[PDB]
């Protein structure tokens, strides 16, 4: 006996087709927004586009291939291997794009004055092409001989009535589990995911250190200003001015040049007076500094804080994407670890296998939602496309 397999199969196929439709629609919208709006045309979004192209291919190719391989149909083993492994190419390309985004945002926060010269559109395109080539090589490695085509399941192949050179096309009969666990999961997925966690940690720490340094320079300027006011010795005001000059030159190195020239000029004026013994003439000259800091230094410090907060909010938005990739793909990899490392364990049931596959495919739908919710420039362009082109 047993429930007709077509019943559970019809649920699985319908759900896969629903995911395919949404993965295509949302990611086409991402590509159309970057094409239309020049504000979205930057190196970071070229990797966003490469990632959207990989998710479009999940809907157009990997999902029809997943439906085909679920039937266990008779096929030449290398044809079967191509259908089984093509999704691993798209997943590897997604990992390289995510890793590129992380390093791009790290270079922007650590060396912003050298960013536009080091990270160019031409260099990004070249990196995108190399990454797509490497993804085909990694994902299709079983086709080079690391496969179970040489050890066919004779009982399964006669039961389904396959011909000569043909196998019943089932993922776990043709793709070796040692490839899936050691090579694909540990080396190609887990290692870059941990590298990305490291890069994001370094982004947040760099921003936190840069923000604390800005605030320190600001309080150093205001503290020593009060030290000059409540002083009595010419060398006492001379020490507070020398400590202000250092904090002023460090704030400049982190219309703009005009405001700092007035400030450093005024410090140098009040310094020459203090060095000549004129303490009261120095203290009155230092009282003028309060007008310069309120008219130029407070505005520059506020704009530098706002830019850094924007980079932190943008780094968090992109980290959510890496987190959702990990959440959607880890169950399938973890199930494979149990199949491989625990031979005394019952194999995970069929319904759980197909639920883990469906969840990994759901990852190809989620990114356009993160862009729409967390990035204003994508959100506004999405609204323009829908309100005018669709409506
Ligand atoms: C460019 C896009 C639109 C076309 C993609 C081509 C796809 C559909 C082609 C290319 C290679 C093909 C496979 C090559 C070999 C075999 C072995 C055979 O025993 C059954 C069919 C099967 C498994 C083919 C199925 C279709 C296939 C996967
Ligand atoms: C739109 C343009 C650019 C792409 C056209 C792609 C063509 C070449 C693809 C799309 C679907 C493909 C077919 C899908 C299924 C099968 C059954 C298999 O047993 C042999 C190959 C065969 C018959 C494929 C041959 C090539 C095919 C017809
Ligand atoms: C949030 C995500 C990353 C964590 C989810 C982990 C999932 C994939 C884990 C948690 C508990 C796990 C199951 C625990 C028990 C068994 C029994 C064994 O005979 C086969 C594997 C199987 C069925 C495990 C498969 C993977 C499993 C379902
Ligand atoms: C079907 C298989 C793969 C999907 C092909 C999708 C490829 C389409 C991506 C190219 C594009 O038009 O994006 C816009 C940017 O180029 C703007 O600069
Ligand atoms: C670009 C399009 C490439 C499409 C080329 C499709 C090549 C099809 C190859 C094929 O179908 O081979 C089946 C084989 O004969 C069964 O044993
Ligand atoms: C690095 C990328 C270069 C990838 C090029 C590697 C060439 C692969 C060789 C090949 O085409 O494989 C034959 C096929 O496996 C027959 O069974
Ligand atoms: C076999 C192919 C493996 C490629 C795995 C991908 C990236 C690893 C990045 C390199 C790790 C070095 C960081 C130290
Ligand atoms: C929200 C996003 C959450 C992430 C989804 C994570 C895992 C898939 C869900 C698995 C649910 C656990 C039930 C599977 C199970 O334990 O049953 C197998 C049984 O033990 C075998 O005999
Ligand atoms: C992130 C959480 C870390 C580890 C999972 C918790 C540790 C669970 C320890 C594994 C249980 C175990 O070893 O039992 C299986 C045994 O082989 C039966 O045959
Ligand atoms: N283990 C596995 N199985 C399948 N499909 C076959 C599901 C199945 C498993 C056992 C069985 O007897 C019949 C069907 N797709 C799979 N995709 C992946 C994968 C992709 C990326 C990481 O893991 N692993 N994986
Ligand atoms: C996304 C969350 C929606 C949940 C949809 C449930 C998905 C899959 C249910 C699994 C059905 C069992 C598949 C039958 C296996 C077979 O093809 O023979
Ligand atoms: C979405 C509608 C597609 C209909 C699928 C039912 C056919 C089937 O699963 O066998
Ligand atoms: C999930 C997918 C979101 C679908 C948004 C619908 C917009 C259609 C625009 C288009 O894809 O051309
Ligand atoms: C079906 C294939 C999907 C190709 C769609 C790519 C769209 C690119 C674009 O928006 O300019
Ligand atoms: C299979 C899908 C792979 C096909 C094409 C990859 C598209 C990558 C997008 C490149 C965008 C970069 C740019 O426009 O400068
Ligand atoms: C195209 C989109 C969906 C259809 C997927 C093709 C399914 C073919 C299964 C092959 C078979 O019947 O054995
Ligand atoms: C874009 C071009 C459209 C692609 C055309 C191919 C469409 C559907 C392929 C359906 C697969 C047919 C499987 C039948 C196998 C069988 O008869 O046993
Ligand atoms: C590029 C797209 C398809 C080319 C793949 C070559 C077909 C490999 C299958 C070989 C076979 O088993 O007959
Ligand atoms: C920009 C588009 C990307 C084009 C890159 C494609 C180049 C393919 C490179 C390596 C593939 C290696 C896997 C071997 C495939 C075996 C083919 C076969 O005989 O079936
Ligand atoms: C890194 C993890 C090393 C794997 C341990 C191998 C244990 C075994 O299967 O014999
Ligand atoms: C299958 C679809 C799975 C996941 C995508 C869910 C995204 C929709 C959430 C938006 C809900 C809302 O309007 O607040
Ligand atoms: Na992806």
Swiss-Prot record:
Transmembrane segments: 11-35, 46-69, 81-103, 124-146, 177-201, 318-341, 350-373
Binding residue positions for adenosine: 172, 336, 360-361
Post-translational modification: Ubiquitinated. Deubiquitinated by USP4; leading to stabilization and expression at the cell surface.
GO BP: any one term: central nervous system development
General function of this protein: Receptor for adenosine. The activity of this receptor is mediated by G proteins which activate adenylyl cyclase.
Quaternary data: Interacts (via cytoplasmic C-terminal domain) with USP4; the interaction is direct. May interact with DRD4. Interacts with NECAB2. Interacts (via cytoplasmic C-terminal domain) with GAS2L2; interaction enhances receptor-mediated adenylyl cyclase activity.
Name this protein carries in UniProt: Adenosine receptor A2a
Gene encoding the protein: ADORA2A
